[PDB]
Every structure is written in C-alpha cells, then in structure tokens.
Amino acid sequence: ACGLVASNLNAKPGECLKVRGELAPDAKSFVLNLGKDSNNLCLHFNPRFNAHGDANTIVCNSKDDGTWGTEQRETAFPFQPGSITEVCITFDQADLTIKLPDGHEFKFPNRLNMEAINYMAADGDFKIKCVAFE
Amino acid sequence: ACGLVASNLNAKPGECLKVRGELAPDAKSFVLNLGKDSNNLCLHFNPRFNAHGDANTIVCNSKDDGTWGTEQRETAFPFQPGSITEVCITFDQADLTIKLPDGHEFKFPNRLNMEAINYMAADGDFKIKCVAFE
Ligand SMILES: OC[C@H]1O[C@@H](O[C@H]2[C@H](O)[C@@H](O)[C@H](O)O[C@@H]2CO)[C@H](O)[C@@H](O)[C@H]1O
Ligand SMILES: OC[C@H]1O[C@@H](O[C@H]2[C@H](O)[C@@H](O)[C@H](O)O[C@@H]2CO)[C@H](O)[C@@H](O)[C@H]1O
Ligand SMILES: [Mg+2]
Ligand SMILES: [Mg+2]
C-alpha cells in the first residue's frame, strides 16, 4: 500500500542514488525503481527475502512501455530484516552499478541508454530514512 | 504536476527532516508537507517567491481532515531561484522547528499533537536532490 514515488528528480550520470530504509522484522520484499515514469524503468531493483518463489535473492529488471525485460538475479543478499540498510546506485549510458552495503557490486545494463532519470520509487517492506540522488 | 509523495515514513521526535532541492530559475513556489496523509498535515511549508498574492514570503499551515488551518507567514526568505537550497525541520508534540539555511529558525505549532510522521510530500518549482528524515 504505502510507498514513495518521485517524478521530480533530475539525476544524471556521475550522481549517486543513496537509499536508506528500515526493513520490517518480517520483510518479504522491497523495491527501488529508477527511470522516466512508472512504465519506463532503467532499473527495477527488488531484493526478495521470500517473494514470488525467490528466497534471499535480488531480482533486477528493466521496464519498457509497460513491458518487463529479461530478469537478472543476484545471490548477494546483505539484508537483515528488522535493521537499516543502505543501497547506492551510480550510472552511465552503458550500465547502472549497484553497490551493496557489504561491498558487493554488480552491473545492470542500461538497456535504453537512459541519460536522465526523473523518476524513482521505493516501496515494499521498509520505512524510508533517506533518498538522495546527487 | 510532478512531485514527491511518500507514505512510508516512520519519523519520530528527535529525528530531523532534511530536504535539498534545486530551485527552478523562474521558481514561483515550492511546498514541503508532513503529516499522516494528504488530508492530515502537521506542517505545510510553502515558500512563495510570487504566488497567490504573496512575494518572497513563507506560508505555513496545518490541514485537519481536508481543512486548512490558520496561516502563519514568515518574512525570512533565503531562497534564490536557480540555486540549491536546504531546509531542515525537527519536531515534538509541541511544535515543529523550521531551520532555514541562513540560520533563521521559527516554530510552527503542532496543532494536531502529532508524534509520528508517516507522510511527506515535496513539489512545486524544484527538483529533489535529497530527502532524509532520520
Ligand atoms: O521482473 C520484475 C518483476 O517480476 C515480477 O514477477 C515475475 C517473476 O519474478 C518471474 O519469476 C515470473 O516468471 O514472472 C513474474 C511476472 O513478471 C513481479 O511480479 C514484479 O513485481 C517485478 O518484480
Ligand atoms: O494555507 C495554505 C494554502 O493556501 C492556499 O491559498 C490560500 C491563500 O494563501 C490565502 O491567502 C487565501 O486566503 O486562501 C487561499 C486558499 O486557502 C493555497 O491555495 C494552498 O496551496 C496552500 O498553500
Ligand atoms: Mg514502503
Ligand atoms: Mg498563525
């Protein structure tokens, strides 16, 4: 139900998205989205504690005119229910780089070579403490 | 039309809201709202460069079940169109304290005696760089 949605960003390559949130003690999933609008996402970042058949797996994807792209799963899962977590994301026209709080990083392709991000959303089983993209 | 809305906060007295935004070169107004939901706000903070008959004036108010309260106008106006600005807000059951970037502060009464903030919004003539409430 509850969530954060912002359509008033003006983020560009070289800037860093930093999101901090407090994970519910029974957290099943949370989502961070970046893009142009809800139907056009260069990144959907979805740690699944236990959701949609995945356990302790991050699912990433893109969304183009409402259509989900090819999923990319990551096994690094430094997320503890009931605690604060921080995720940082940088990007350029080739890839987004996701930096997890244990020092794991991975790339997700910038499939539509998006160079301006004006939309973000954060929702699921956590309460927001910080969103910065600067 | 664009803006930020979050219903997934869990802010408590002793935590500080910090908002950074890039003001449009022709900015007329921006708004920061805090409360339970869009109809129930312990603080509506509205710097008006030139809007609704006010020039370089901050208008603050509360909103109770959809009804605006008594306005409080502040003359301190350390906001420059085309630049980044930062506003910090603290609160307790008595008052919210607004801390402006030039060191001016003022209090706005917490009329609804709200001790938990789950909702915030930021919109108007700026682009968000940071929202933190922690
Ligand atoms: O791809 C992100 C998207 O996934 C949806 O669930 C997928 C699921 O991960 C996959 O295993 C299945 O094959 O297709 C489902 C439907 O596309 C989620 O529903 C959605 O929220 C996103 O997370
Ligand atoms: O009170 C905040 C609220 O003000 C509305 O405008 C007011 C205006 O400030 C006041 O001078 C006039 O008497 O009543 C108007 C309507 O309540 C704004 O429209 C609204 O956006 C808020 O900023
Ligand atoms: Mg949420
Ligand atoms: Mg008054």
PDB file of C-alpha atoms and ligand atoms in Angstrom:
ATOM      1  CA  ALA A   1       0.000   0.000   0.000  1.00  0.00           C
ATOM      2  CA  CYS A   2       2.328   2.739   1.224  1.00  0.00           C
ATOM      3  CA  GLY A   3       5.331   3.825  -0.774  1.00  0.00           C
ATOM      4  CA  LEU A   4       7.463   6.644  -2.090  1.00  0.00           C
ATOM      5  CA  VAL A   5       7.122   7.967  -5.633  1.00  0.00           C
ATOM      6  CA  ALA A   6       9.048  10.935  -7.029  1.00  0.00           C
ATOM      7  CA  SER A   7       8.697  12.294 -10.550  1.00  0.00           C
ATOM      8  CA  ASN A   8      10.684  15.452  -9.764  1.00  0.00           C
ATOM      9  CA  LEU A   9      14.246  14.187  -9.956  1.00  0.00           C
ATOM     10  CA  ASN A  10      16.764  15.449 -12.483  1.00  0.00           C
ATOM     11  CA  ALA A  11      19.544  12.937 -11.988  1.00  0.00           C
ATOM     12  CA  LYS A  12      22.395  12.461 -14.429  1.00  0.00           C
ATOM     13  CA  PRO A  13      25.483  10.279 -14.819  1.00  0.00           C
ATOM     14  CA  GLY A  14      28.082  10.895 -12.126  1.00  0.00           C
ATOM     15  CA  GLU A  15      25.437  11.366  -9.463  1.00  0.00           C
ATOM     16  CA  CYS A  16      24.807   8.704  -6.874  1.00  0.00           C
ATOM     17  CA  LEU A  17      21.488   7.427  -5.644  1.00  0.00           C
ATOM     18  CA  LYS A  18      21.634   6.576  -1.970  1.00  0.00           C
ATOM     19  CA  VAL A  19      18.653   4.954  -0.292  1.00  0.00           C
ATOM     20  CA  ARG A  20      18.413   4.142   3.407  1.00  0.00           C
ATOM     21  CA  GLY A  21      15.462   2.380   4.912  1.00  0.00           C
ATOM     22  CA  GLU A  22      14.470   0.330   7.906  1.00  0.00           C
ATOM     23  CA  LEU A  23      13.493  -3.208   6.970  1.00  0.00           C
ATOM     24  CA  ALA A  24      10.410  -4.660   8.574  1.00  0.00           C
ATOM     25  CA  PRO A  25      11.151  -7.501  11.010  1.00  0.00           C
ATOM     26  CA  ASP A  26       9.056  -9.817   8.802  1.00  0.00           C
ATOM     27  CA  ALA A  27      10.146  -8.268   5.487  1.00  0.00           C
ATOM     28  CA  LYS A  28       9.377 -10.290   2.375  1.00  0.00           C
ATOM     29  CA  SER A  29      10.412  -7.855  -0.364  1.00  0.00           C
ATOM     30  CA  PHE A  30      11.335  -4.278  -1.163  1.00  0.00           C
ATOM     31  CA  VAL A  31      11.715  -2.391  -4.412  1.00  0.00           C
ATOM     32  CA  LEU A  32      13.681   0.552  -5.723  1.00  0.00           C
ATOM     33  CA  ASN A  33      12.746   1.793  -9.196  1.00  0.00           C
ATOM     34  CA  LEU A  34      14.512   4.337 -11.422  1.00  0.00           C
ATOM     35  CA  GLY A  35      13.524   5.717 -14.803  1.00  0.00           C
ATOM     36  CA  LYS A  36      11.235   8.147 -16.622  1.00  0.00           C
ATOM     37  CA  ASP A  37       7.933   7.061 -15.184  1.00  0.00           C
ATOM     38  CA  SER A  38       6.276   4.002 -13.715  1.00  0.00           C
ATOM     39  CA  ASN A  39       6.084   2.311 -17.124  1.00  0.00           C
ATOM     40  CA  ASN A  40       9.606   3.122 -18.254  1.00  0.00           C
ATOM     41  CA  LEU A  41      12.299   1.991 -15.858  1.00  0.00           C
ATOM     42  CA  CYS A  42      16.004   1.694 -16.474  1.00  0.00           C
ATOM     43  CA  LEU A  43      16.234  -0.180 -13.180  1.00  0.00           C
ATOM     44  CA  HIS A  44      13.880  -2.199 -11.020  1.00  0.00           C
ATOM     45  CA  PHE A  45      15.871  -3.441  -8.019  1.00  0.00           C
ATOM     46  CA  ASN A  46      13.961  -5.989  -5.953  1.00  0.00           C
ATOM     47  CA  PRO A  47      15.534  -7.826  -3.026  1.00  0.00           C
ATOM     48  CA  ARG A  48      13.239 -10.753  -2.287  1.00  0.00           C
ATOM     49  CA  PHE A  49      13.584 -12.241   1.188  1.00  0.00           C
ATOM     50  CA  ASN A  50      10.744 -14.590   0.336  1.00  0.00           C
ATOM     51  CA  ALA A  51       8.548 -13.485  -2.558  1.00  0.00           C
ATOM     52  CA  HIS A  52       7.362 -14.756  -5.932  1.00  0.00           C
ATOM     53  CA  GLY A  53       9.191 -18.046  -5.379  1.00  0.00           C
ATOM     54  CA  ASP A  54      12.580 -16.447  -4.647  1.00  0.00           C
ATOM     55  CA  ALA A  55      14.393 -16.611  -1.305  1.00  0.00           C
ATOM     56  CA  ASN A  56      17.196 -14.194  -0.380  1.00  0.00           C
ATOM     57  CA  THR A  57      17.708 -13.228  -3.995  1.00  0.00           C
ATOM     58  CA  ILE A  58      17.868  -9.827  -5.655  1.00  0.00           C
ATOM     59  CA  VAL A  59      15.847  -9.615  -8.853  1.00  0.00           C
ATOM     60  CA  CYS A  60      16.661  -6.792 -11.238  1.00  0.00           C
ATOM     61  CA  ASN A  61      14.939  -5.814 -14.443  1.00  0.00           C
ATOM     62  CA  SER A  62      14.021  -3.020 -16.804  1.00  0.00           C
ATOM     63  CA  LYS A  63      10.580  -1.940 -17.994  1.00  0.00           C
ATOM     64  CA  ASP A  64       9.895  -0.540 -21.463  1.00  0.00           C
ATOM     65  CA  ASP A  65       6.464   0.909 -22.237  1.00  0.00           C
ATOM     66  CA  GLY A  66       4.991  -1.279 -19.504  1.00  0.00           C
ATOM     67  CA  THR A  67       6.764  -4.496 -20.509  1.00  0.00           C
ATOM     68  CA  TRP A  68       9.233  -6.177 -18.162  1.00  0.00           C
ATOM     69  CA  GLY A  69      12.551  -7.106 -19.718  1.00  0.00           C
ATOM     70  CA  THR A  70      14.878 -10.019 -19.027  1.00  0.00           C
ATOM     71  CA  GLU A  71      15.416 -10.637 -15.336  1.00  0.00           C
ATOM     72  CA  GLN A  72      18.845 -10.641 -13.733  1.00  0.00           C
ATOM     73  CA  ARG A  73      19.211 -12.426 -10.389  1.00  0.00           C
ATOM     74  CA  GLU A  74      21.957 -11.766  -7.849  1.00  0.00           C
ATOM     75  CA  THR A  75      22.824 -14.001  -4.913  1.00  0.00           C
ATOM     76  CA  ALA A  76      24.463 -11.335  -2.757  1.00  0.00           C
ATOM     77  CA  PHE A  77      21.930 -10.628  -0.038  1.00  0.00           C
ATOM     78  CA  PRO A  78      23.335  -8.477   2.791  1.00  0.00           C
ATOM     79  CA  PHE A  79      19.897  -7.574   4.105  1.00  0.00           C
ATOM     80  CA  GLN A  80      18.700  -8.291   7.631  1.00  0.00           C
ATOM     81  CA  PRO A  81      15.016  -7.956   8.479  1.00  0.00           C
ATOM     82  CA  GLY A  82      14.486  -5.518  11.339  1.00  0.00           C
ATOM     83  CA  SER A  83      17.558  -3.418  10.540  1.00  0.00           C
ATOM     84  CA  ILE A  84      18.591  -0.399   8.499  1.00  0.00           C
ATOM     85  CA  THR A  85      20.039  -0.965   5.073  1.00  0.00           C
ATOM     86  CA  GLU A  86      21.670   1.311   2.545  1.00  0.00           C
ATOM     87  CA  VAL A  87      21.949   0.782  -1.207  1.00  0.00           C
ATOM     88  CA  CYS A  88      23.903   3.033  -3.561  1.00  0.00           C
ATOM     89  CA  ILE A  89      23.498   3.153  -7.321  1.00  0.00           C
ATOM     90  CA  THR A  90      25.518   5.008  -9.950  1.00  0.00           C
ATOM     91  CA  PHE A  91      25.030   5.037 -13.685  1.00  0.00           C
ATOM     92  CA  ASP A  92      26.189   5.927 -17.110  1.00  0.00           C
ATOM     93  CA  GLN A  93      24.735   5.287 -20.525  1.00  0.00           C
ATOM     94  CA  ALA A  94      26.120   1.705 -20.625  1.00  0.00           C
ATOM     95  CA  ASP A  95      25.268   0.309 -17.189  1.00  0.00           C
ATOM     96  CA  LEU A  96      23.957   1.027 -13.739  1.00  0.00           C
ATOM     97  CA  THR A  97      26.267  -0.049 -10.924  1.00  0.00           C
ATOM     98  CA  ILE A  98      24.620  -1.310  -7.763  1.00  0.00           C
ATOM     99  CA  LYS A  99      26.714  -1.072  -4.618  1.00  0.00           C
ATOM    100  CA  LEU A 100      25.544  -3.197  -1.738  1.00  0.00           C
ATOM    101  CA  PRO A 101      26.405  -2.440   1.886  1.00  0.00           C
ATOM    102  CA  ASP A 102      28.793  -5.411   2.250  1.00  0.00           C
ATOM    103  CA  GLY A 103      30.962  -4.243  -0.660  1.00  0.00           C
ATOM    104  CA  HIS A 104      29.389  -6.436  -3.309  1.00  0.00           C
ATOM    105  CA  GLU A 105      28.782  -4.622  -6.559  1.00  0.00           C
ATOM    106  CA  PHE A 106      27.166  -5.640  -9.784  1.00  0.00           C
ATOM    107  CA  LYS A 107      26.204  -4.034 -13.053  1.00  0.00           C
ATOM    108  CA  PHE A 108      22.829  -3.943 -14.687  1.00  0.00           C
ATOM    109  CA  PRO A 109      22.687  -2.951 -18.349  1.00  0.00           C
ATOM    110  CA  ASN A 110      21.195   0.424 -19.196  1.00  0.00           C
ATOM    111  CA  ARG A 111      19.113  -1.149 -21.921  1.00  0.00           C
ATOM    112  CA  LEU A 112      17.659   2.038 -23.347  1.00  0.00           C
ATOM    113  CA  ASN A 113      20.792   4.109 -22.723  1.00  0.00           C
ATOM    114  CA  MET A 114      18.891   6.455 -20.470  1.00  0.00           C
ATOM    115  CA  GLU A 115      20.997   9.520 -19.527  1.00  0.00           C
ATOM    116  CA  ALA A 116      18.458  11.412 -17.464  1.00  0.00           C
ATOM    117  CA  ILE A 117      16.481   9.959 -14.580  1.00  0.00           C
ATOM    118  CA  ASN A 118      13.470  11.915 -13.321  1.00  0.00           C
ATOM    119  CA  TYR A 119      11.503   9.135 -11.680  1.00  0.00           C
ATOM    120  CA  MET A 120      12.155   6.999  -8.658  1.00  0.00           C
ATOM    121  CA  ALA A 121      10.051   4.869  -6.393  1.00  0.00           C
ATOM    122  CA  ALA A 122      10.736   2.946  -3.224  1.00  0.00           C
ATOM    123  CA  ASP A 123       8.254   0.617  -1.648  1.00  0.00           C
ATOM    124  CA  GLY A 124       7.661  -2.737  -0.030  1.00  0.00           C
ATOM    125  CA  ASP A 125       8.529  -3.855   3.453  1.00  0.00           C
ATOM    126  CA  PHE A 126      10.531  -0.957   4.753  1.00  0.00           C
ATOM    127  CA  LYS A 127      10.282   2.588   6.028  1.00  0.00           C
ATOM    128  CA  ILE A 128      12.298   5.242   4.268  1.00  0.00           C
ATOM    129  CA  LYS A 129      15.064   7.103   6.116  1.00  0.00           C
ATOM    130  CA  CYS A 130      16.865   8.730   3.195  1.00  0.00           C
ATOM    131  CA  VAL A 131      16.633   9.122  -0.541  1.00  0.00           C
ATOM    132  CA  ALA A 132      19.314  11.178  -2.244  1.00  0.00           C
ATOM    133  CA  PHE A 133      20.329  11.366  -5.859  1.00  0.00           C
ATOM    134  CA  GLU A 134      23.088  13.918  -6.199  1.00  0.00           C
TER     135      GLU A 134
ATOM    136  CA  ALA B   1       2.175  18.152 -11.808  1.00  0.00           C
ATOM    137  CA  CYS B   2       5.376  16.289 -10.904  1.00  0.00           C
ATOM    138  CA  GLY B   3       6.375  15.831  -7.309  1.00  0.00           C
ATOM    139  CA  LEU B   4       7.412  13.532  -4.492  1.00  0.00           C
ATOM    140  CA  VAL B   5       4.912  11.737  -2.264  1.00  0.00           C
ATOM    141  CA  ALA B   6       5.913   9.283   0.453  1.00  0.00           C
ATOM    142  CA  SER B   7       3.546   7.427   2.757  1.00  0.00           C
ATOM    143  CA  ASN B   8       6.231   5.072   4.050  1.00  0.00           C
ATOM    144  CA  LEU B   9       7.948   7.183   6.654  1.00  0.00           C
ATOM    145  CA  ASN B  10       8.028   6.407  10.352  1.00  0.00           C
ATOM    146  CA  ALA B  11       9.576   9.573  11.723  1.00  0.00           C
ATOM    147  CA  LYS B  12       9.602  10.353  15.436  1.00  0.00           C
ATOM    148  CA  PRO B  13      10.527  13.327  17.630  1.00  0.00           C
ATOM    149  CA  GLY B  14      14.286  13.737  17.775  1.00  0.00           C
ATOM    150  CA  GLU B  15      14.705  12.896  14.110  1.00  0.00           C
ATOM    151  CA  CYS B  16      15.455  15.629  11.599  1.00  0.00           C
ATOM    152  CA  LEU B  17      13.951  16.152   8.185  1.00  0.00           C
ATOM    153  CA  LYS B  18      16.497  17.443   5.720  1.00  0.00           C
ATOM    154  CA  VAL B  19      15.397  18.391   2.225  1.00  0.00           C
ATOM    155  CA  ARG B  20      17.695  19.575  -0.561  1.00  0.00           C
ATOM    156  CA  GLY B  21      16.313  20.697  -3.890  1.00  0.00           C
ATOM    157  CA  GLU B  22      17.405  22.652  -6.942  1.00  0.00           C
ATOM    158  CA  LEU B  23      15.096  25.637  -7.397  1.00  0.00           C
ATOM    159  CA  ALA B  24      13.954  26.414 -10.921  1.00  0.00           C
ATOM    160  CA  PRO B  25      15.465  29.550 -12.482  1.00  0.00           C
ATOM    161  CA  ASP B  26      11.935  31.014 -12.657  1.00  0.00           C
ATOM    162  CA  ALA B  27      10.626  29.465  -9.436  1.00  0.00           C
ATOM    163  CA  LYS B  28       7.337  30.825  -8.140  1.00  0.00           C
ATOM    164  CA  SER B  29       6.587  28.406  -5.283  1.00  0.00           C
ATOM    165  CA  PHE B  30       7.575  25.133  -3.656  1.00  0.00           C
ATOM    166  CA  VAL B  31       5.952  23.037  -0.961  1.00  0.00           C
ATOM    167  CA  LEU B  32       7.014  20.588   1.719  1.00  0.00           C
ATOM    168  CA  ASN B  33       4.215  18.710   3.502  1.00  0.00           C
ATOM    169  CA  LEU B  34       4.418  16.497   6.593  1.00  0.00           C
ATOM    170  CA  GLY B  35       1.713  14.534   8.337  1.00  0.00           C
ATOM    171  CA  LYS B  36      -0.339  11.336   8.247  1.00  0.00           C
ATOM    172  CA  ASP B  37      -1.703  11.643   4.769  1.00  0.00           C
ATOM    173  CA  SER B  38      -2.550  14.288   2.192  1.00  0.00           C
ATOM    174  CA  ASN B  39      -5.605  15.452   4.150  1.00  0.00           C
ATOM    175  CA  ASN B  40      -3.948  15.485   7.558  1.00  0.00           C
ATOM    176  CA  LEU B  41      -0.818  17.585   7.750  1.00  0.00           C
ATOM    177  CA  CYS B  42       1.008  18.808  10.808  1.00  0.00           C
ATOM    178  CA  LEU B  43       3.017  21.071   8.510  1.00  0.00           C
ATOM    179  CA  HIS B  44       2.519  22.617   5.098  1.00  0.00           C
ATOM    180  CA  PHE B  45       5.622  24.699   4.379  1.00  0.00           C
ATOM    181  CA  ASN B  46       5.227  26.893   1.308  1.00  0.00           C
ATOM    182  CA  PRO B  47       7.857  29.417   0.244  1.00  0.00           C
ATOM    183  CA  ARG B  48       6.159  31.727  -2.249  1.00  0.00           C
ATOM    184  CA  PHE B  49       8.517  33.659  -4.494  1.00  0.00           C
ATOM    185  CA  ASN B  50       5.472  35.049  -6.238  1.00  0.00           C
ATOM    186  CA  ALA B  51       2.313  33.023  -5.781  1.00  0.00           C
ATOM    187  CA  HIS B  52      -1.242  33.540  -4.570  1.00  0.00           C
ATOM    188  CA  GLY B  53      -0.601  37.224  -3.974  1.00  0.00           C
ATOM    189  CA  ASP B  54       2.480  36.683  -1.782  1.00  0.00           C
ATOM    190  CA  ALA B  55       6.000  37.749  -2.744  1.00  0.00           C
ATOM    191  CA  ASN B  56       9.106  36.313  -1.016  1.00  0.00           C
ATOM    192  CA  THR B  57       7.037  35.051   1.888  1.00  0.00           C
ATOM    193  CA  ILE B  58       6.852  31.632   3.503  1.00  0.00           C
ATOM    194  CA  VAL B  59       3.319  30.476   4.214  1.00  0.00           C
ATOM    195  CA  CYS B  60       2.879  27.690   6.748  1.00  0.00           C
ATOM    196  CA  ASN B  61      -0.280  25.922   7.757  1.00  0.00           C
ATOM    197  CA  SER B  62      -1.789  22.712   9.059  1.00  0.00           C
ATOM    198  CA  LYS B  63      -4.546  20.631   7.469  1.00  0.00           C
ATOM    199  CA  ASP B  64      -7.105  18.697   9.513  1.00  0.00           C
ATOM    200  CA  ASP B  65      -9.380  16.248   7.688  1.00  0.00           C
ATOM    201  CA  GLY B  66      -9.000  18.243   4.491  1.00  0.00           C
ATOM    202  CA  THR B  67      -9.482  21.692   6.058  1.00  0.00           C
ATOM    203  CA  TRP B  68      -6.667  24.266   6.070  1.00  0.00           C
ATOM    204  CA  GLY B  69      -5.943  25.856   9.431  1.00  0.00           C
ATOM    205  CA  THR B  70      -4.820  29.363  10.308  1.00  0.00           C
ATOM    206  CA  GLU B  71      -1.956  30.569   8.114  1.00  0.00           C
ATOM    207  CA  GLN B  72       1.374  31.647   9.563  1.00  0.00           C
ATOM    208  CA  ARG B  73       3.523  33.890   7.377  1.00  0.00           C
ATOM    209  CA  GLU B  74       7.297  34.279   7.736  1.00  0.00           C
ATOM    210  CA  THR B  75       9.379  37.048   6.178  1.00  0.00           C
ATOM    211  CA  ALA B  76      12.703  35.209   6.235  1.00  0.00           C
ATOM    212  CA  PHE B  77      13.292  34.188   2.616  1.00  0.00           C
ATOM    213  CA  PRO B  78      16.821  32.887   1.960  1.00  0.00           C
ATOM    214  CA  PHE B  79      15.909  31.223  -1.338  1.00  0.00           C
ATOM    215  CA  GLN B  80      17.427  32.052  -4.727  1.00  0.00           C
ATOM    216  CA  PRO B  81      15.820  30.799  -7.932  1.00  0.00           C
ATOM    217  CA  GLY B  82      18.299  28.713  -9.916  1.00  0.00           C
ATOM    218  CA  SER B  83      20.221  27.504  -6.857  1.00  0.00           C
ATOM    219  CA  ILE B  84      20.227  24.583  -4.478  1.00  0.00           C
ATOM    220  CA  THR B  85      18.536  25.088  -1.135  1.00  0.00           C
ATOM    221  CA  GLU B  86      18.312  23.053   2.027  1.00  0.00           C
ATOM    222  CA  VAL B  87      15.617  23.134   4.702  1.00  0.00           C
ATOM    223  CA  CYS B  88      15.752  21.230   7.976  1.00  0.00           C
ATOM    224  CA  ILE B  89      12.806  20.514  10.242  1.00  0.00           C
ATOM    225  CA  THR B  90      12.651  18.982  13.712  1.00  0.00           C
ATOM    226  CA  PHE B  91       9.601  18.291  15.827  1.00  0.00           C
ATOM    227  CA  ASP B  92       7.984  17.237  19.030  1.00  0.00           C
ATOM    228  CA  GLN B  93       4.450  17.185  20.321  1.00  0.00           C
ATOM    229  CA  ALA B  94       4.544  20.943  20.938  1.00  0.00           C
ATOM    230  CA  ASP B  95       5.967  22.402  17.729  1.00  0.00           C
ATOM    231  CA  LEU B  96       7.835  21.844  14.546  1.00  0.00           C
ATOM    232  CA  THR B  97      11.016  23.875  14.270  1.00  0.00           C
ATOM    233  CA  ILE B  98      11.929  25.033  10.791  1.00  0.00           C
ATOM    234  CA  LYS B  99      15.614  25.750  10.254  1.00  0.00           C
ATOM    235  CA  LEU B 100      16.391  27.841   7.219  1.00  0.00           C
ATOM    236  CA  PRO B 101      19.781  27.829   5.503  1.00  0.00           C
ATOM    237  CA  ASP B 102      20.721  31.364   6.632  1.00  0.00           C
ATOM    238  CA  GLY B 103      20.297  30.448  10.306  1.00  0.00           C
ATOM    239  CA  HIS B 104      16.788  31.795  10.719  1.00  0.00           C
ATOM    240  CA  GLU B 105      14.528  29.467  12.664  1.00  0.00           C
ATOM    241  CA  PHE B 106      10.872  29.616  13.550  1.00  0.00           C
ATOM    242  CA  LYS B 107       8.323  27.407  15.260  1.00  0.00           C
ATOM    243  CA  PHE B 108       5.025  26.195  13.920  1.00  0.00           C
ATOM    244  CA  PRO B 109       2.606  24.779  16.497  1.00  0.00           C
ATOM    245  CA  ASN B 110       1.922  21.059  16.276  1.00  0.00           C
ATOM    246  CA  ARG B 111      -1.820  21.631  16.308  1.00  0.00           C
ATOM    247  CA  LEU B 112      -2.800  18.005  15.881  1.00  0.00           C
ATOM    248  CA  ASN B 113      -0.285  16.924  18.569  1.00  0.00           C
ATOM    249  CA  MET B 114       1.187  14.506  16.098  1.00  0.00           C
ATOM    250  CA  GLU B 115       4.016  12.337  17.479  1.00  0.00           C
ATOM    251  CA  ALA B 116       4.558  10.136  14.442  1.00  0.00           C
ATOM    252  CA  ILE B 117       5.028  11.309  10.865  1.00  0.00           C
ATOM    253  CA  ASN B 118       4.285   8.725   8.183  1.00  0.00           C
ATOM    254  CA  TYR B 119       3.628  11.066   5.226  1.00  0.00           C
ATOM    255  CA  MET B 120       5.651  13.661   3.367  1.00  0.00           C
ATOM    256  CA  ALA B 121       5.415  15.413   0.052  1.00  0.00           C
ATOM    257  CA  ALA B 122       7.597  17.827  -1.853  1.00  0.00           C
ATOM    258  CA  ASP B 123       6.531  19.579  -5.013  1.00  0.00           C
ATOM    259  CA  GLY B 124       6.482  22.845  -6.897  1.00  0.00           C
ATOM    260  CA  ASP B 125       9.260  24.567  -8.746  1.00  0.00           C
ATOM    261  CA  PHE B 126      12.222  22.470  -7.809  1.00  0.00           C
ATOM    262  CA  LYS B 127      14.000  19.181  -8.396  1.00  0.00           C
ATOM    263  CA  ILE B 128      14.693  16.952  -5.411  1.00  0.00           C
ATOM    264  CA  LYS B 129      18.311  16.148  -4.513  1.00  0.00           C
ATOM    265  CA  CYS B 130      17.804  14.712  -1.037  1.00  0.00           C
ATOM    266  CA  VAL B 131      15.046  13.855   1.369  1.00  0.00           C
ATOM    267  CA  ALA B 132      16.095  12.395   4.713  1.00  0.00           C
ATOM    268  CA  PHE B 133      14.137  12.004   7.918  1.00  0.00           C
ATOM    269  CA  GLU B 134      16.314  10.275  10.477  1.00  0.00           C
TER     270      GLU B 134
HETATM  271  O1  LIG C   1      10.871  -8.777 -13.304  1.00  0.00           O
HETATM  272  C1  LIG C   1      10.498  -7.983 -12.205  1.00  0.00           C
HETATM  273  C2  LIG C   1       9.059  -8.251 -11.868  1.00  0.00           C
HETATM  274  O2  LIG C   1       8.899  -9.608 -11.552  1.00  0.00           O
HETATM  275  C3  LIG C   1       7.558  -9.960 -11.386  1.00  0.00           C
HETATM  276  O3  LIG C   1       7.493 -11.335 -11.150  1.00  0.00           O
HETATM  277  C4  LIG C   1       7.971 -12.137 -12.198  1.00  0.00           C
HETATM  278  C5  LIG C   1       8.816 -13.227 -11.592  1.00  0.00           C
HETATM  279  O4  LIG C   1       9.993 -12.719 -10.967  1.00  0.00           O
HETATM  280  C6  LIG C   1       9.205 -14.286 -12.603  1.00  0.00           C
HETATM  281  O5  LIG C   1       9.746 -15.368 -11.920  1.00  0.00           O
HETATM  282  C7  LIG C   1       7.974 -14.742 -13.356  1.00  0.00           C
HETATM  283  O6  LIG C   1       8.471 -15.509 -14.382  1.00  0.00           O
HETATM  284  O7  LIG C   1       7.318 -13.666 -13.932  1.00  0.00           O
HETATM  285  C8  LIG C   1       6.806 -12.805 -12.936  1.00  0.00           C
HETATM  286  C9  LIG C   1       5.870 -11.823 -13.574  1.00  0.00           C
HETATM  287  O8  LIG C   1       6.556 -10.995 -14.483  1.00  0.00           O
HETATM  288  C10 LIG C   1       6.973  -9.239 -10.199  1.00  0.00           C
HETATM  289  O9  LIG C   1       5.613  -9.503 -10.127  1.00  0.00           O
HETATM  290  C11 LIG C   1       7.184  -7.737 -10.368  1.00  0.00           C
HETATM  291  O10 LIG C   1       6.822  -7.077  -9.183  1.00  0.00           O
HETATM  292  C12 LIG C   1       8.619  -7.415 -10.685  1.00  0.00           C
HETATM  293  O11 LIG C   1       9.416  -7.691  -9.574  1.00  0.00           O
HETATM  294  O1  LIG C   2      -2.829  27.828   3.694  1.00  0.00           O
HETATM  295  C1  LIG C   2      -2.021  27.142   2.782  1.00  0.00           C
HETATM  296  C2  LIG C   2      -2.732  27.012   1.453  1.00  0.00           C
HETATM  297  O2  LIG C   2      -3.011  28.303   0.969  1.00  0.00           O
HETATM  298  C3  LIG C   2      -3.815  28.299  -0.184  1.00  0.00           C
HETATM  299  O3  LIG C   2      -4.028  29.629  -0.549  1.00  0.00           O
HETATM  300  C4  LIG C   2      -4.744  30.373   0.389  1.00  0.00           C
HETATM  301  C5  LIG C   2      -4.109  31.714   0.485  1.00  0.00           C
HETATM  302  O4  LIG C   2      -2.776  31.570   0.983  1.00  0.00           O
HETATM  303  C6  LIG C   2      -4.884  32.678   1.344  1.00  0.00           C
HETATM  304  O5  LIG C   2      -4.325  33.920   1.195  1.00  0.00           O
HETATM  305  C7  LIG C   2      -6.311  32.697   0.878  1.00  0.00           C
HETATM  306  O6  LIG C   2      -6.959  33.377   1.872  1.00  0.00           O
HETATM  307  O7  LIG C   2      -6.834  31.413   0.890  1.00  0.00           O
HETATM  308  C8  LIG C   2      -6.183  30.563  -0.037  1.00  0.00           C
HETATM  309  C9  LIG C   2      -6.936  29.273  -0.116  1.00  0.00           C
HETATM  310  O8  LIG C   2      -6.942  28.617   1.118  1.00  0.00           O
HETATM  311  C10 LIG C   2      -3.120  27.607  -1.313  1.00  0.00           C
HETATM  312  O9  LIG C   2      -4.037  27.513  -2.365  1.00  0.00           O
HETATM  313  C11 LIG C   2      -2.684  26.214  -0.868  1.00  0.00           C
HETATM  314  O10 LIG C   2      -1.895  25.629  -1.877  1.00  0.00           O
HETATM  315  C12 LIG C   2      -1.914  26.258   0.430  1.00  0.00           C
HETATM  316  O11 LIG C   2      -0.682  26.874   0.238  1.00  0.00           O
HETATM  317 MG    MG C   3       7.097   1.063   1.537  1.00  0.00          MG
HETATM  318 MG    MG C   4      -0.787  31.961  12.613  1.00  0.00          MG
END
